[PDB]
Design a protein around this motif. Sequence first.
Motif, mmCIF file in Angstrom:
data_model
loop_
_atom_site.group_PDB
_atom_site.id
_atom_site.type_symbol
_atom_site.label_atom_id
_atom_site.label_comp_id
_atom_site.label_asym_id
_atom_site.label_seq_id
_atom_site.Cartn_x
_atom_site.Cartn_y
_atom_site.Cartn_z
ATOM 1 N N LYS A 1 -57.977 -29.292 -8.211
ATOM 2 C CA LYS A 1 -56.723 -28.705 -8.688
ATOM 3 C C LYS A 1 -56.168 -27.770 -7.636
ATOM 4 O O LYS A 1 -56.917 -27.018 -7.006
ATOM 5 N N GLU A 2 -54.856 -27.808 -7.444
ATOM 6 C CA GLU A 2 -54.202 -26.869 -6.546
ATOM 7 C C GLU A 2 -53.624 -25.680 -7.308
ATOM 8 O O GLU A 2 -52.977 -25.843 -8.349
ATOM 9 N N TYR A 3 -53.895 -24.484 -6.789
ATOM 10 C CA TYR A 3 -53.292 -23.257 -7.287
ATOM 11 C C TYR A 3 -52.594 -22.610 -6.103
ATOM 12 O O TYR A 3 -53.214 -21.860 -5.327
ATOM 13 N N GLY A 4 -51.310 -22.927 -5.946
ATOM 14 C CA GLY A 4 -50.575 -22.557 -4.745
ATOM 15 C C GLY A 4 -51.185 -23.184 -3.493
ATOM 16 O O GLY A 4 -51.492 -24.388 -3.466
ATOM 17 N N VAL A 5 -51.367 -22.375 -2.452
ATOM 18 C CA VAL A 5 -51.988 -22.854 -1.211
ATOM 19 C C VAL A 5 -53.500 -22.998 -1.383
ATOM 20 O O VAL A 5 -54.182 -23.585 -0.534
ATOM 21 N N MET A 6 -54.024 -22.461 -2.484
ATOM 22 C CA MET A 6 -55.448 -22.599 -2.720
ATOM 23 C C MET A 6 -55.713 -23.894 -3.464
ATOM 24 O O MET A 6 -54.809 -24.470 -4.057
ATOM 25 N N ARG A 7 -56.954 -24.353 -3.385
ATOM 26 C CA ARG A 7 -57.340 -25.674 -3.832
ATOM 27 C C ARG A 7 -58.801 -25.630 -4.287
ATOM 28 O O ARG A 7 -59.676 -25.135 -3.564
ATOM 29 N N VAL A 8 -59.066 -26.135 -5.490
ATOM 30 C CA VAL A 8 -60.394 -26.007 -6.079
ATOM 31 C C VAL A 8 -60.947 -27.303 -6.666
ATOM 32 O O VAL A 8 -60.332 -27.921 -7.531
ATOM 33 N N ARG A 9 -62.121 -27.710 -6.192
ATOM 34 C CA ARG A 9 -62.842 -28.775 -6.863
ATOM 35 C C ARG A 9 -64.037 -28.271 -7.627
ATOM 36 O O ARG A 9 -64.911 -27.640 -7.069
ATOM 37 N N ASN A 10 -64.054 -28.569 -8.917
ATOM 38 C CA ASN A 10 -65.230 -28.408 -9.748
ATOM 39 C C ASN A 10 -66.200 -29.535 -9.391
ATOM 40 O O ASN A 10 -65.992 -30.684 -9.759
ATOM 41 N N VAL A 11 -67.250 -29.207 -8.645
ATOM 42 C CA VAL A 11 -68.225 -30.203 -8.235
ATOM 43 C C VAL A 11 -69.260 -30.499 -9.335
ATOM 44 O O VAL A 11 -69.570 -31.662 -9.615
ATOM 45 N N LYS A 12 -69.791 -29.457 -9.967
ATOM 46 C CA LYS A 12 -70.752 -29.657 -11.057
ATOM 47 C C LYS A 12 -70.802 -28.468 -12.019
ATOM 48 O O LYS A 12 -70.579 -27.316 -11.630
ATOM 49 N N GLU A 13 -71.073 -28.769 -13.283
ATOM 50 C CA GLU A 13 -71.274 -27.747 -14.298
ATOM 51 C C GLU A 13 -72.674 -27.881 -14.860
ATOM 52 O O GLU A 13 -73.105 -28.986 -15.233
ATOM 53 N N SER A 14 -73.385 -26.757 -14.913
ATOM 54 C CA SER A 14 -74.808 -26.787 -15.177
ATOM 55 C C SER A 14 -75.109 -25.845 -16.316
ATOM 56 O O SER A 14 -75.477 -24.692 -16.100
ATOM 57 N N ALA A 15 -74.936 -26.347 -17.535
ATOM 58 C CA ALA A 15 -75.052 -25.532 -18.738
ATOM 59 C C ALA A 15 -76.468 -25.010 -18.951
ATOM 60 O O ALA A 15 -77.429 -25.778 -19.116
ATOM 61 N N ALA A 16 -76.589 -23.688 -18.924
ATOM 62 C CA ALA A 16 -77.823 -23.040 -19.324
ATOM 63 C C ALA A 16 -77.655 -22.590 -20.770
ATOM 64 O O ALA A 16 -76.569 -22.696 -21.356
ATOM 65 N N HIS A 17 -78.737 -22.094 -21.345
ATOM 66 C CA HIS A 17 -78.706 -21.607 -22.708
ATOM 67 C C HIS A 17 -77.737 -20.424 -22.895
ATOM 68 O O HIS A 17 -77.063 -20.303 -23.921
ATOM 69 N N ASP A 18 -77.675 -19.556 -21.891
ATOM 70 C CA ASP A 18 -76.927 -18.310 -22.002
ATOM 71 C C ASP A 18 -75.574 -18.403 -21.348
ATOM 72 O O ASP A 18 -74.611 -17.786 -21.788
ATOM 73 N N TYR A 19 -75.512 -19.194 -20.287
ATOM 74 C CA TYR A 19 -74.327 -19.284 -19.452
ATOM 75 C C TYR A 19 -74.087 -20.722 -18.993
ATOM 76 O O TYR A 19 -74.919 -21.607 -19.210
ATOM 77 N N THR A 20 -72.942 -20.939 -18.352
ATOM 78 C CA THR A 20 -72.637 -22.200 -17.692
ATOM 79 C C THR A 20 -72.299 -21.875 -16.243
ATOM 80 O O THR A 20 -71.399 -21.073 -15.995
ATOM 81 N N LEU A 21 -73.026 -22.453 -15.290
ATOM 82 C CA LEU A 21 -72.637 -22.334 -13.885
ATOM 83 C C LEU A 21 -71.581 -23.406 -13.549
ATOM 84 O O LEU A 21 -71.520 -24.427 -14.223
ATOM 85 N N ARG A 22 -70.745 -23.172 -12.533
ATOM 86 C CA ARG A 22 -69.765 -24.168 -12.058
ATOM 87 C C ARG A 22 -69.616 -24.165 -10.545
ATOM 88 O O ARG A 22 -68.932 -23.307 -9.993
ATOM 89 N N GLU A 23 -70.223 -25.131 -9.866
ATOM 90 C CA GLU A 23 -70.058 -25.214 -8.416
ATOM 91 C C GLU A 23 -68.610 -25.640 -8.024
ATOM 92 O O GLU A 23 -68.138 -26.741 -8.381
ATOM 93 N N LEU A 24 -67.903 -24.758 -7.314
ATOM 94 C CA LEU A 24 -66.514 -25.024 -6.940
ATOM 95 C C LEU A 24 -66.315 -24.948 -5.440
ATOM 96 O O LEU A 24 -66.706 -23.961 -4.820
ATOM 97 N N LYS A 25 -65.697 -25.973 -4.856
ATOM 98 C CA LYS A 25 -65.349 -25.952 -3.430
ATOM 99 C C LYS A 25 -63.924 -25.460 -3.323
ATOM 100 O O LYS A 25 -63.030 -26.027 -3.943
ATOM 101 N N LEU A 26 -63.715 -24.403 -2.544
ATOM 102 C CA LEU A 26 -62.392 -23.797 -2.394
ATOM 103 C C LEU A 26 -61.895 -23.922 -0.962
ATOM 104 O O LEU A 26 -62.671 -23.779 -0.017
ATOM 105 N N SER A 27 -60.605 -24.207 -0.806
ATOM 106 C CA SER A 27 -60.004 -24.279 0.519
ATOM 107 C C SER A 27 -58.517 -23.971 0.514
ATOM 108 O O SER A 27 -57.907 -23.702 -0.516
ATOM 109 N N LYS A 28 -57.947 -24.008 1.706
ATOM 110 C CA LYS A 28 -56.521 -23.837 1.874
ATOM 111 C C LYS A 28 -55.885 -25.216 2.073
ATOM 112 O O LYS A 28 -56.421 -26.068 2.787
ATOM 113 N N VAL A 29 -54.767 -25.446 1.402
ATOM 114 C CA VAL A 29 -53.988 -26.644 1.647
ATOM 115 C C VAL A 29 -53.487 -26.605 3.091
ATOM 116 O O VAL A 29 -52.918 -25.603 3.535
ATOM 117 N N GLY A 30 -53.725 -27.683 3.832
ATOM 118 C CA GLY A 30 -53.350 -27.749 5.234
ATOM 119 C C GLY A 30 -54.547 -27.862 6.161
ATOM 120 O O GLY A 30 -54.718 -28.868 6.850
#
Length: 494
Positions: A344-373
């Motif tokens: 997903k693009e948020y302005g010039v920023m850009r985010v991929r949700n690579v994986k979600e790893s649900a724990a009992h208490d929390y959910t982790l989310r590996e995200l790759k972030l970059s600049k468009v361009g």
Amino acid sequence: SRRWFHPNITGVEAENLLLTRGVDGSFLARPSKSNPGDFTLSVRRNGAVTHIKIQNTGDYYDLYGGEKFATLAELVQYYMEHHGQLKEKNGDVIELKYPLNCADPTSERWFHGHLSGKEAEKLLTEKGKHGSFLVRESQSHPGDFVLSVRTGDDNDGKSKVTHVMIRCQELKYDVGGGERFDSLTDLVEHYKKNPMVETLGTVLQLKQPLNTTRINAAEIESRVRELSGFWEEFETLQQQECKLLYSRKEGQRQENKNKNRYKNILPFDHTRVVLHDSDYINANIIMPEKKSYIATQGCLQNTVNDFWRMVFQENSRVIVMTTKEVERGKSKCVKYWPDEYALKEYGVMRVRNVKESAAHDYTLRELKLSKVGQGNTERTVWQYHFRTWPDHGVPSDPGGVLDFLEEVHHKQESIMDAGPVVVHCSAGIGRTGTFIVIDILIDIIREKGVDCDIDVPKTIQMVRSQRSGMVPTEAQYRFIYMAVQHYIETLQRR
């Protein structure tokens, strides 16, 4: 300067006080004793006391019929320069003109209550320095008091401890001659501007109270036992929020008002996160005064782009989310991350949700972030969304929080670059400050083991001077102590 806080008064005596000693405009604040953790604002108006309520459920101070605030001191400082702004339901305004000042010295740092003389002597001898002082109850004369000051250098005989006697005769205080003060406070405050000087030259600066709160990490169990002084340590920490009314000009500018989730809860200018990627985000750097934090509100729709601008800019790689997107009925933080496997693009920023790893208490989310361009700017950003925090108050066990922070701590630690850790909840001061302080304390212990010095209130006040009203509730306070305690006996597992 928080003299308008009366911490032991019932609502019905607050009527009397405003009526016998008050005039129209006169006001005080007091703890709601019908809603522990809440507060009630009492304002005399047309010969009549009216009690306005202030809720604090962990997120912020909610003036019933007013707005929402970071500390009580900021609330009051607000309305005394925003007349007309305290309206009542029916339209007419309530003026906050004259602080009814309290005489109860208990919530003062320097005030110790009981305490013997030799005992104070040990303390002032062992912990004290030049200018260090305290006030205790006599001792030889019930109703009376004793102030005790250390003076000297760094055994030597070059340092000493002088005791001055404070008589309470008919509601007023004095050092045996001269002026008589209405309160111990006014007495003290005075002799800090105008030190008592002894016959033979010696000057008694009231230069700092005596630390009563620092403890060795190892004997935390015992100190907790005793506070079950908790409300009293906390109330005493509340009382210094008046020293923290730093400017927040940038937060208030017309262009930034809609970037604030709550219009009145604002970053200090001197620690705000400035963007050079406008430059405004409701976000403060929290530096332990190695590893830092950014404390921030949850994303508003019109801010999500900035949030990513900031995460990029700061080179942050771990984000701690402490709030469900909607809680108790109301928006708390808009979803600013992509669904799993999505980009997903948020302005010039850009985010991929690579994986979600649900724990009992929390959910982790590996995200790759970059600049468009530029495709090289890609950085993994690990989002630890915490799921199991009650909409009302604090969790039962601290274990869950603790296991969550360890995981977070290790992630931050494993990434060498890694800028500040981002933490947010609703307003970004309650749960946010609560984790950050817990994290800070554990970190100290972690680097210095169990025989080290910690000081919870000193730590909270340290953080409160960087963002407004961090850890607002006695429940969060007690919980911070419960967590650290817990952390210890699991270290003693090995």
